[PDB]
């Protein structure tokens, strides 16, 4: 695929909440969030080209792309929001 997996790192949780948002806006409802090593990761899987880019801008201005794999957050992380997180958080924050 040229689609996309997208793992970014934010400090806090309340990143997450203030971008989520913006991710609706663009017709992002979904991703999962887990929370590992004292921070917060959001992931968002099978992404065309063009939102996935479109995400990334959203997402580099509250975190970084990490380095730790999907396998570590999911084996040794913990799950917090499974697969739904974007319409979740607007529900409550919205």
């Given at each position: ?16 909440i203030?971008?989520?948002e ?19 990761f ?29 396998y ?11 697969g ?11």
């Amino acid at each position: 695929d040229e689609s996309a997996d997208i793992i970014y790192q934010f400090h806090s949780f309340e990143d997450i909440i203030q971008l989520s948002e913006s991710l609706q806006r663009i017709g992002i409802t979904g991703g999962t969030v887990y929370h590992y090593d004292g921070q917060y990761f959001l992931s968002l899987e099978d992404l065309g080209s063009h939102t996935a880019e479109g995400v990334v801008a959203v997402l580099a201005e509250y975190g970084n792309p990490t380095t730790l794999t999907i396998y570590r957050l999911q084996e040794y992380g913990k799950l917090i929001m499974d697969g739904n997180a974007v319409e979740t958080i607007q529900t409550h924050f919205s």
